Amino acid sequence: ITAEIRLSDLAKVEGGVVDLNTLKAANIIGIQIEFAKVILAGEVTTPVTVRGLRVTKGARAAIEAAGGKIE
Amino acid sequence: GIREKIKLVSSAGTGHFYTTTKNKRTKPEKLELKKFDPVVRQHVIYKEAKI
């Protein structure tokens, strides 16, 4: 019941808010997944505020380089 | 047969131990070697004990 969210498939939800339930409705991760993680898969453009998801050190650099905040 | 096996247990530290063989009939006293404990990371007096 944990997921491994590829950074490329992140700006595909609701502007720039990726809680978990929003990320689930985008069909990125399964329904019975309460913990999730954003890894450095590459390529971000828009600023995405990642609230609730555990974020990787490599992705924290990228997401903030694009403009998006975390928590 | 004959020569049984023993458990050399550490004094100062965690319950880490070595195991060796020993002839109990010929040598009725107990061993007291000074071997290396890797949990403490130190050479310590290891005393003989049973399994």
Binding site: - | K5, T19, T20, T21
Partner: protein
């Protein structure tokens, strides 16, 4: 019907990234005091399955 995995095989092998399988070494359950520590050290880490006995593993667990 679906292929049933040989469950015992599923519990002793794990699929690596390239395709091969890691497995735990034999001779590290009991009768350890007579074994030299250099053996026991070398048998501790997981190891890859050889190309001879790979096809037997690939057959008995087709899923992963």
């Amino acid at each position: 019907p679906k292929i049933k995995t040989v469950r015992g095989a599923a519990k002793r092998f794990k699929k690596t990234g390239k395709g091969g399988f890691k497995h735990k070494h034999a001779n590290l359950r009991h009768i350890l005091t007579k074994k030299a520590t250099k053996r026991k050290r070398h048998l501790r880490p997981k190891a890859m399955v050889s190309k001879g006995d790979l096809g037997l593993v690939i057959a008995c667990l087709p899923y992963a």
